[PDB]
């Protein structure tokens, strides 16, 4: 009578896994995206006699840090980081966040933004002089040349804050930015200092890293697992009916 | 949870939305039309 609940848990968590996979597939064109991993954990129920009931719980263990494919766009402000490297932005709630989106934009007032989040430099958020032409070097250095002026007068303005962090040290926040895990925060500090060993390419944008093969295989597996759980539910549903209706 | 094993935790996304479409302000090429009324701009400037 309670195997129906085990099968129902399996089917519901299969639905959750399918939702995760569909959300990953919907962002196949999102610039600088990290796919969410999915794994079904097994929770064994601990009673006294025979733990013959073990349930299923869907989980998302971090994300995927494999870089995607770089689109070469003839623009100086689109940048791509090294493998396992992160650009730093000031988060929505006045905090710090890390990202791979190298689509740096400028405003009328001259401040650099990523998705609307101001970028964080050595001295705080980076502000470029109003209406200047901007070039980004291979180590984060930013040069600004005023329009209609000799290129000789170009001068550096600041340096981007580029950090290095692996998947174990990084957890996705609800606003799409990545942050440090508590266990990584305890060791590497609240704020990560700039890592000078990371090279950055200017003029190339990093796309998403969702793998179509894994997504399609996961969808097929989810469908089949759901059908099996429905069969288990149906088998349990007939037996209980007969039993009660007759042994009364 | 409080932490070997894999960091447990169900975190589900929502989808994808388009925020803003941006135009690439890069200098295009020049084509020769002998009409004296046509002018091309070498740089970032707009006729008002």
């Amino acid at each position: 009578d309670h195997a129906i609940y085990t099968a129902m848990g399996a089917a519901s968590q299969t639905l959750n896994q399918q939702a995760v996979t569909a959300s990953n597939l919907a962002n196949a064109s999102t610039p600088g995206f990290r796919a969410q991993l999915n794994a079904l954990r097994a929770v064994p129920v601990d009673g006294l006699s025979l733990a013959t009931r073990t349930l299923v719980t869907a989980s998302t263990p971090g994300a995927d840090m494999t870089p995607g494919q770089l689109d070469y766009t003839s623009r100086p402000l689109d940048v791509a980081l090294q493998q396992d490297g992160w650009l730093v932005v000031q988060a929505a709630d006045g905090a710090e966040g890390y990202t791979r989106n190298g689509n740096i934009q400028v405003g009328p007032t001259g401040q650099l933004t990523i998705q609307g989040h101001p970028v964080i430099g050595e001295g705080g958020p980076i502000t470029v002089p109003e209406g200047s032409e901007i070039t980004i070097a291979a180590d984060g250095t930013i040069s600004a040349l005023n329009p209609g002026d000799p290129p000789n007068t170009v001068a550096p303005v600041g340096r981007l804050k580029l950090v290095k962090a692996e998947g174990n040290e990084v957890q996705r926040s609800d606003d799409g930015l990545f942050r440090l895990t508590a266990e990584a925060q305890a060791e590497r500090g609240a704020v990560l200092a700039a890592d000078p060993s990371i090279r950055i390419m200017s003029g190339v944008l990093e796309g998403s890293n969702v793998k179509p093969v894994e997504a399609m295989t996961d969808m097929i597996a989810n469908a089949r697992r759901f059908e099996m759980q429905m069969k288990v539910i149906t088998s349990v549903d007939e037996n209980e009916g007969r039993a009660n209706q007759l042994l009364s | 949870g409080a932490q070997t094993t894999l960091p447990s935790g169900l975190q589900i996304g929502t989808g994808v939305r388009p925020v803003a479409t941006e135009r690439l302000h890069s200098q295009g090429n020049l084509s020769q039309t002998n009409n004296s009324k046509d002018v091309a701009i070498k740089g970032q400037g707009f006729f008002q």
Binding site: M8, G9, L55, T57 | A2
Partner: peptide, 16 residues
């Protein structure tokens, strides 16, 4: 002490 019957109390609850 009873509780919510069915789906809520038969799905793996959060730790705390």
């Amino acid at each position: 002490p009873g509780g919510v019957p069915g789906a809520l109390s038969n799905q793996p609850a959060p730790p705390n």
